[PDB]
Design a protein around this ligand. Structure first.
Ligand SMILES: Cc1cc2nc3c(=O)[nH]c(=O)nc-3n(C[C@H](O)[C@H](O)[C@H](O)COP(=O)(O)OP(=O)(O)OC[C@H]3O[C@@H](n4cnc5c(N)ncnc54)[C@H](O)[C@@H]3O)c2cc1C
Ligand SMILES: Cc1cc2nc3c(=O)[nH]c(=O)nc-3n(C[C@H](O)[C@H](O)[C@H](O)COP(=O)(O)OP(=O)(O)OC[C@H]3O[C@@H](n4cnc5c(N)ncnc54)[C@H](O)[C@@H]3O)c2cc1C
Ligand SMILES: N#CCC(=O)N1CCC(C(N)=O)CC1
Ligand SMILES: N#CCC(=O)N1CCC(C(N)=O)CC1
Lengths: 588, 588
């Protein structure tokens, strides 16, 4: 058991020192490695409970049983005397740079997961290359290093959400005694985009500075895995070449889908284009009903736009549907229009985009409702939010042997390994995993520690909390109510719930019984909390902390015995008492 | 053991039915009581661990072993047939109403704990009186039902905190694209107070409605305990009388102190006066350094007041002093002035308050610094926040025999019992307990269930999370860093920490390395989280959820294995890695 671990650690680690915290000979070796700017992992045998077994097992590689022992890419290099001999003979640099491959690690994709994996591997002396390329959108949009979240996802999305929330702050300000008049104030889209883009650009630069200071090679080129160890690259001059690496991490992400109707690609846009659009969208049609669709329609409406969402069937498929409808109801009461049970049939161009005067075009949209009645209306912008997908055929020659599932995602073991022993996958292309930025970062850093530092910790993908940043936010951790009932039966599930009103909403004369929270519990497992749900301001700040308690197996009794913080919205979770079976109203 | 619980429950309950869910003879008795509108507790024996043992023990009181059995104030009343005989004969009302005392429970004090205890007791059939009276401040300020939090504490102070937070929202809105000029907007104090006071009044009225619909007798009267079961009352006409109750709960709270110096009571005010002050305070001096003092100085400055705080020694005594100093540093850089190591000697009047034209007076404050140097400066308002204390000699005749401590607070067992067997104390006057509103509510609700419904659950007073609502908020759960070092030794403590910047602050050009958080951990106990600390926006919402995890014994690895919600401030707790021992900078 220990022997299998040691052999896997020695085989993949780039440079690794087996040591003890007391030993001065180990310290002497540490000092020479630092002075020569040699990065390496280190394992302190006296810190691990079975260090005695590991010490003995090292002899199977080195013929010796003492510390220090230093290895390079699977080969024993020597003890203290031998290492210093290589140092004072100027032989040591060539020893540690000896490799069958160009790099110890090649990362394909410079986004959330890939940057995280690459920076971490480099800390333990792995020679690392990170490749990133941004295929332009149909109208040409492109952006810098860092991936979807940084450039065209979480970061610009929540910044524009914040600009929307500030509209209600200006409203609420009058009731708390400030002299402004909200009705005389308007919003300038291009001023907002300029500010958002400036922050995004400082992240683009920050990541390039980070890869430089960690000694990671950054290639702005499109990568393609042609054999288990061979990556073909194409640069911005279409020059083609091949690089090799020992371990390969795939982290190339997804891009937005388009519906297969005439005029879509030509005359509409997606979220990839929206966050740097040089003109206000104007009257806008959003097609879709995912969180991306609803969040985008949500802040466009708060910024003052005329917005419609075209919904094929339901909102937020895959989320708790009672919560989903409350989310929708709030948007519809606050100026978002919905076209329900409706799908688009074609887009016609009435005006070309006025690139000079900086104005949108004009489009005619035709569709139909599920009963067959007709939809026809004009909009200035059409935004498609109908899902996202990878295109791994552009990354992965089928002959390499990497297995994919029905949806084109990569089938991995619980340690991110693909069907090819030296290739791994992380992030949105890892089949069946939650498609979220912090998941992709944790997977990437933990994998790098397993490959190059002998770590064993795995990424835990269960009960990861979410927040949908709609105008009233929706946070969750665990199972939806319908999922819990499906799995255990209605008789074994209890639901505690309550409305609430933020204290900030009192003086501002906002709604009495719109915000809502529930806990979904299992009767037979000591009232274990199966899922938590909250609709309200700052839902992500509210929810995050409870994710640790749910991770630890929290029950209703743990919620009850914890005392609230007053006055907060989140304290309502600590005093819940009305069950759904009781039929008592949850208003307050 | 079971015997003694059943004894305690029967002698204390007002009206209690021992039942089984399956039995139709019980259903028959429940319905008769519901129709006659008799409230009562119910113990379902088929839903308890040893319900079969209680069945046999019930015979000691009733000589029967069957179910249902009904008791009134310790006395067995009858089985199914006997209750129906009393009901058919019009004998039931007089049986359930007969008592040695006027009330089953008298609550002295209508505040956070008192109202919570009284409502809960009335649910289980206890005949309940709640007494509340608000002795005026020296300038005559007075308010309605609800206690300190509702009228002159948590609720008005956080509402005024929000009015101050909205000032930075107006500033931020320009950077996010809105067309307003913050420099041309001003605040109106009295418009704010009117909105605040109208909401407080909707809570005064709601409590009076809630007591009525629970059949609780509300007496706007000053109560005094003269004997174990005898409460003397004095109404608004100074008419005196005596009522008697079985159980007594003292819940009378505290009031603010004044320093023993000339002119203070005459010419200064306290928080009791601030929340309904009819004029803007003007140039203000706050004397003290508790959370009250800093919270008030904080929003006065944000509303555009000229504010100074005078500090004897340190800020926020009893809280983590690193956090405390970061709190004050933020205030000082955003326009609160501090006069450190300074105390007051006397207050002189220069102008009287102009009550007609609605203007403050003018005062001269004389004091000295800790070295010997002198303080002299004029202010329009002077607010004292130098602590709070009870005045139990008003409430409680020393001949009754209720033991107080050296501070004047009630010494209680862990179930809130005083030295007199039927008298209990809850809330701020309970010695050694955290003085917080959710604590008082839980103590009062749980005690009511032990008295009248046979509950056994106690209030847990440990690791209760707090939030200080200064201009930059500060939340905490558990031990300060210094307290952990002292209790366990510096070699057994590891502290993880990190600065952070909210995403919302990026586009609005706010500070980079001001918000800050840390986990105080015990090495020798699996890196248990001893205390959590966070300085930043929405700190109460952030902290609350982790209180549940800390209650359950969370460790650093529990925080590590939980995934973050992105983008939030709170997610920074899920990736902490820089330790203080390592000396690495926590900046970002
Ligand atoms: C509008 C929107 C909002 C979102 N909001 C949130 C949110 O609030 N919270 C959250 O947790 N998640 C959010 N997400 C999801 C989050 O962006 C993703 O889960 C995350 O970016 C996944 O990271 P990744 O490393 O898997 O891929 P990516 O971040 O997409 O990075 C992959 C990179 O590889 C590049 N690449 C592709 N093919 C090649 C190739 N052949 N050669 C070289 N480079 C290549 C891509 O151009 C890209 O730069 C949002 C997504 C969207 C679209
Ligand atoms: C400025 C300020 C801000 C605060 N902010 C917070 C906060 O954000 N969060 C928090 O958790 N806590 C806060 N607190 C503390 C919180 O208000 C108290 O812990 C809580 O009010 C205590 O409740 P209680 O039931 O013990 O007493 P109280 O709420 O004070 O109620 C006691 C009541 O009994 C009345 N009474 C007194 N003597 C008699 C008598 N003889 N007969 C009849 N009635 C009598 C009193 O007049 C009062 O109405 C704050 C306190 C202050 C002063
Ligand atoms: N259907 C369909 C067409 C389609 O989805 N395209 C839009 C995205 C473009 C890109 N971002 O690389 C090219 C491919
Ligand atoms: N209620 C009320 C307010 C009140 O009566 N005062 C409390 C402090 C007293 C003092 N320390 O000299 C002055 C009187």
């Amino acid at each position: 058991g220990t022997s299998q671990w040691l052999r896997k650690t020695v085989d993949s680690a780039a440079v690794i020192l087996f040591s003890k915290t007391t030993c001065p000979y180990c310290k002497k070796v540490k000092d020479v490695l630092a002075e020569a700017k040699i990065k390496h992992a280190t394992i302190e045998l006296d810190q691990l409970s079975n260090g005695s077994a590991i010490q003995k097992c090292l002899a199977s590689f080195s013929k010796i049983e003492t510390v220090p022992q230093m290895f390079v890419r699977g080969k024993f290099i020597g003890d203290s005397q031998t290492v210093l001999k290589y140092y004072s003979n100027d032989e040591l640099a060539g020893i540690v740079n000896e490799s069958k491959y160009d790099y110890d690690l090649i990362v394909i994709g410079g986004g959330s997961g890939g940057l995280a994996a690459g920076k971490e591997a480099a800390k333990y002396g792995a020679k690392t290359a990170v490749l990133d390329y941004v295929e332009p959108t149909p109208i040409g949009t492109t952006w810098g290093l860092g991936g979807t979240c940084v450039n065209v996802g979480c970061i610009p999305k929540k910044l524009m959400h914040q600009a929307g929330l500030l509209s209600h702050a200006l409203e609420d300000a009058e009731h708390f005694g400030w002299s402004l008049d909200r009705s005389k104030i308007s919003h300038n889209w291009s001023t907002m985009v300029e500010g958002v883009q400036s922050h995004i650009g400082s992240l683009n630069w920050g990541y390039k500075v980070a890869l430089r200071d960690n000694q990671v090679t950054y290639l702005n080129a499109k990568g393609r895995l042609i054999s288990p160890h061979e990556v073909q690259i194409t640069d911005k001059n279409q020059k083609v070449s091949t690089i090799t690496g020992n371990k390969i991490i795939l982290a190339t992400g997804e891009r937005p889908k388009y519906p297969e109707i005439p005029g879509a690609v030509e005359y509409g846009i997606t979220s990839d284009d929206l966050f740097s659009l040089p003109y206000f969208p104007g009257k806008t049609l959003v097609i879709g009903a995912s969180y991306v669709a609803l969040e985008c329609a949500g802040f466009l409406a708060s910024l003052g736009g005329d917005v419609t969402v075209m919904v094929r069937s339901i909102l937020l498929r895959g989320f708790d549907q009672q919560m989903a409808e409350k989310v929708g109801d709030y948007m519809e009461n606050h100026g978002v229009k919905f076209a329900k049970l409706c799908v688009p049939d074609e887009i016609k161009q009435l005006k070309v985009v006025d690139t000079e005067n900086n104005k949108p075009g004009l489009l005619l949209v035709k569709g139909h409702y599920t009963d067959g009645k007709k939809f026809e209306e004009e909009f200035e912008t059409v935004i498609f939010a109908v899902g996202r997908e990878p295109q791994l055929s552009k990354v992965l020659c089928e002959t390499v042997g990497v297995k994919l599932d029905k949806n084109g995602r990569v089938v991995c073991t619980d340690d991110e390994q693909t069907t090819v022993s030296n290739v791994y996958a992380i992030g949105d292309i890892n089949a069946g995993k939650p498609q979220l930025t912090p998941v992709a970062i944790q997977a990437g850093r933990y994998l790098a520690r397993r490959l190059f530092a002998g770590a064993t910790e795995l990424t835990d993908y269960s009960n990861v909390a979410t927040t949908v940043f709609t105008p009233l936010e929706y946070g969750a951790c665990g199972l939806s109510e319908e999922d819990a009932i499906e799995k255990y039966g209605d008789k074994d599930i209890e639901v505690y719930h309550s409305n609430f009103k933020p204290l900030e909403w009192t003086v501002a004369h906002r709604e009495d019984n719109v915000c809502y929270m529930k806990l979904v519990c299992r009767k037979s497992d000591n009232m274990r909390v199966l899922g938590l749900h909250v609709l309200g301001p700052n839902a992500g700040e509210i929810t995050q902390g409870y994710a640790v308690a749910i991770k630890m197996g929290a029950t209703k009794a743990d919620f009850d015995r914890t005392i609230g913080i007053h006055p907060t919205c989140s304290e309502t979770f600590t005093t819940l008492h009305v069950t759904k079976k009781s039929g008592v109203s949850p208003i307050v």
